[PDB]
Design a protein around this ligand. Structure first.
Ligand SMILES: *[C@@H]1O[C@H](CO)[C@@H](O[C@@H]2O[C@H](CO)[C@@H](O[C@@H]3O[C@H](CO[C@H]4O[C@H](CO)[C@@H](O)[C@H](O)[C@@H]4O)[C@@H](O)[C@H](O)[C@@H]3O)[C@H](O)[C@H]2NC(C)=O)[C@H](O)[C@H]1NC(C)=O
Ligand SMILES: *[C@@H]1O[C@H](CO)[C@@H](O[C@@H]2O[C@H](CO)[C@@H](O)[C@H](O)[C@H]2NC(C)=O)[C@H](O)[C@H]1NC(C)=O
Ligand SMILES: *[C@@H]1O[C@H](CO)[C@@H](O[C@@H]2O[C@H](CO)[C@@H](O)[C@H](O)[C@H]2NC(C)=O)[C@H](O)[C@H]1NC(C)=O
Ligand SMILES: *[C@@H]1O[C@H](CO)[C@@H](O[C@@H]2O[C@H](CO)[C@@H](O)[C@H](O)[C@H]2NC(C)=O)[C@H](O)[C@H]1NC(C)=O
Ligand SMILES: [Cl-]
Length: 627
């Protein structure tokens, strides 16, 4: 195929074209990006006196454990405590462990910060050391530290101890422990609350993020971060929706909530931690607000919305408001960040195409109020575009699609037919999820992808060339989901996977990275690909340097030759860089083979006219300099 590349651009490529979509799914927040190592650290949103309330906690020796509704809890937000009892007639180490999120990486180059609160519910004669530490799951101590406590301590008391392992563990099958001497402790009861164990964090932020994951996200060169959902925004009912103000301030004051993926969220990854991550990485937010619908099916009635609209105003004021003018903005300043954060885009709800009967009045009432308070923000509608008709007219829509790899290359012209009428489009969730057109959301046995494949990433890349061609109206696009804990998964495939110790970069990750890191500010129109075909391309140019990025997706089973014609340019470099992602159709990066499929860089001969053989199932970027 002969591809003519015009010198005169057709439009400016948005700075926001490629970015990330986050919600806490597959333990992407708790157990993932948020660096806390203890699971069920504060007994949030569990039922006292059940086995479920003790999830992740285990006795050492003859310890007796129960989660209680404490008569004198550590805080209003944290009503549950761990009741630890040592039988009379005891000796030797006694206590309890936390298994982490399916393990804990123990590294001799890391300092860990352990903390907990305790009190004796009945004043006692106990006198002895409280030891915290890390052990292998077979019981070998890796690190420990201790402090003296007394049974006369009936008031809540925080212990803060560092841990300094001298040797790394051989694997991640390790636990945090708390012990006393069982002879000293015989017959004693202690109540505990609000445990925490942190490793070193990204940018050394207090209450911050897991560095290997945070660095992997920054490596893809994203421009935006959509958060906090996604389904995790919505709750199952009004009462269990995400609420900004429950996620800020002391961890003692964050109640947590039951999320939308079968597990409790601590809300330790809260609004300020998100915003600080954006500052640390150069991303801008696309922030969602709850919009009167929850996943159990209930829409608030129109005459019930006012307090929820106010809460959305408060949320935005926390991010951008003048501290002198609102309580939320004053709270951001009191938490150490008096300058406003950047916020250009707010999404109204999530997937309101499931509740399109009520979205017209919810959209109308939310956006009327929010646009008046925040004239500069662009509000994003979540129903299917133009059906139903919304008032006020949306300036943006969020479009989601989960489909087969084949659908993606067949639908690369999705935006070409749209009118250009001042509305922009956010492809806020997309992925090729299954090879089974008849059951997309099924099991791996029935075609669901466990991990992205070369097939899936190449189909996505073909669709992405269409997003880039149509970036006069498409302003943003993000794969979903972003993150997966391989030991606790509710959705596959995912962009980036991990266990307690290591990260896996998928084929799709590398397609996202190749697109985002090789993107000019000028879109150069070219000969169109075949609508419905397997071979697609998109060309952009950096206005300041002349670097010219030719992105090619061959989503089919045969190699195809392209002849690029750049004769409209006065000069084209005689060599270019070539970056190629390819492999067997069904190949994936997995925990067992995490680098099976990675990009390869080389040089190729270029000029005013030059050829390139795009392999079957490949994503290629050719970079030349043009003037
Ligand atoms: C700005 O440009 C937009 C993009 O071109 C315009 O969007 C179009 O808006 C009209 C309403 O004004 C929509 O038309 C409705 O279509 C439905 C039926 O639809 C569906 O089936 C067709 C096959 O026929 C399919 O293409 C869709 O995906 C659906 O499966 C009618 O029942 C209504 O009475 C009405 O005709 C278009 O659907 C819509 N196009 C797209 C691509 O979304 C928009 O109106 C413009 N906005 C302004 C303010 O001017
Ligand atoms: C036990 O924990 C304490 C408290 O975290 C550690 O003491 C700190 O050590 C660091 C690094 O040497 C100092 O910067 C702090 O000033 C110390 N704080 C206090 C309150 O003393 C101590 O190193 C830990 N001991 C072991 C064996 O891990
Ligand atoms: C977060 O703020 C919301 C208000 O924006 C609080 O919810 C209100 O709580 C009061 C007292 O229980 C109720 O009478 C109101 O009906 C609630 N309003 C809404 C909109 O839900 C919520 O309690 C705050 N969360 C925390 C942890 O303090
Ligand atoms: C967490 O998931 C990992 C990755 O799947 C598990 O490690 C694998 O375990 C299987 C079954 O024992 C082995 O065949 C693989 O070779 C292991 N893979 C790797 C890369 O080590 C791990 O066991 C899981 N952890 C828990 C606690 O279930
Ligand atoms: Cl397919």
């Amino acid at each position: 195929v002969t591809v003519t590349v015009n010198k005169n651009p057709s439009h400016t490529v948005p700075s926001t074209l490629y970015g990330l979509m986050f919600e806490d799914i597959n333990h992407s927040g708790d157990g993932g990006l948020y660096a806390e190592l203890l699971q069920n650290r504060a007994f949030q949103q569990v039922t006292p006196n059940t086995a479920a309330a003790l999830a992740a906690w285990h006795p050492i020796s003859n310890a007796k454990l129960a989660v209680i509704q404490d008569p004198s809890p550590v805080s209003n937000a944290l009503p549950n405590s761990l009741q630890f009892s040592v039988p009379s007639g005891s000796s030797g180490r006694v206590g309890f462990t936390n298994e982490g999120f399916w393990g804990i990486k123990v590294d001799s180059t890391w300092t860990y910060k352990a903390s907990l609160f305790f009190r004796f519910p009945t004043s006692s004669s106990f006198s002895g050391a409280l030891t915290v530490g890390l052990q292998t799951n077979a019981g070998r101590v890796l690190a420990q530290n201790s402090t003296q406590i007394r049974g006369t301590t009936t008031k809540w008391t925080q212990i803060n101890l560092e841990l300094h392992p001298t040797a790394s563990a051989p694997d991640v099958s390790n636990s945090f422990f708390v012990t006393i001497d069982g002879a000293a402790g015989a017959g004693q009861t202690i109540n505990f609350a609000m445990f925490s164990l942190f490793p070193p964090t990204f940018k050394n932020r207090p209450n911050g993020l897991r560095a290997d994951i945070a660095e992997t996200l920054a490596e893809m060169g994203p421009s935006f971060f959509r958060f906090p959902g996604g389904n995790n925004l919505e709750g199952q009912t009004t009462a269990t929706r995400w609420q900004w103000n429950a996620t800020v301030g002391s961890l003692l004051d964050r109640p947590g909530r039951v999320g939308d993926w079968g597990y409790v969220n601590t809300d330790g990854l809260g609004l300020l931690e998100y915003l600080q991550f954006f500052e640390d990485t150069g991303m801008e937010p696309i922030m969602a607000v709850w919009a009167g619908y929850s996943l159990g099916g209930t829409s608030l009635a129109e005459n019930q919305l006012a307090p929820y609209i106010q809460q959305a105003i408060d949320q935005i004021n926390f991010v951008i408001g003048d501290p002198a003018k609102s309580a939320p903005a004053a709270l951001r300043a009191s938490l150490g960040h008096p300058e406003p954060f950047t916020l250009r885009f707010v999404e109204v709800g999530n997937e309101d195409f499931f509740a399109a009967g009520s979205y017209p009045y919810r959209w109308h009432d939310f956006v009327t109020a929010l646009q008046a308070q925040f004239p500069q923000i662009r509000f994003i509608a979540t129903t299917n575009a133009w059906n139903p008709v919304l008032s006020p007219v949306p300036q943006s829509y969020d479009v989601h699609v989960y489909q087969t790899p084949t659908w993606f290359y067949q639908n690369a012209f999705y935006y070409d037919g749209f009118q250009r009428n001042g509305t922009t489009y956010f492809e806020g969730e997309y992925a090729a999820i299954s090879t089974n057109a008849n059951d997309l959301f099924g099991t791996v046995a029935d075609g669901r992808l466990a991990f992205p494949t070369v097939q899936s990433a190449t189909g996505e890349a073909a669709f992405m060339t269409g997003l880039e061609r149509n970036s006069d109206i498409v302003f943003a696009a993000s794969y979903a989901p972003l993150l997966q804990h391989v030991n606790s998964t509710q959705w596959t495939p995912d962009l980036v996977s991990y266990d307690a110790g290591s990260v896996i970069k998928s084929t799709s990750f590398f397609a996202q990275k190749l697109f985002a890191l090789n993107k000019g500010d000028q879109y150069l129109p070219s000969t169109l690909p075949t609508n419905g075909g397997t071979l697609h391309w998109s060309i952009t140019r950096a206005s300041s340097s002349g670097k010219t990025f030719i992105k090619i997706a061959n989503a089919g089973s045969s190699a195809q030759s392209l002849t690029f014609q750049l004769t409209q340019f006065n000069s084209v470099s005689s060599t270019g860089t070539l970056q190629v992602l390819t492999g067997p159709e069904t190949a994936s990066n997995t925990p067992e083979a995490p680098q099976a499929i990675v990009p390869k860089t080389s040089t190729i001969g270029t000029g005013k006219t030059f050829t390139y053989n795009a392999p079957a199932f490949s994503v290629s970027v050719i970079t030349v300099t043009t003037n």
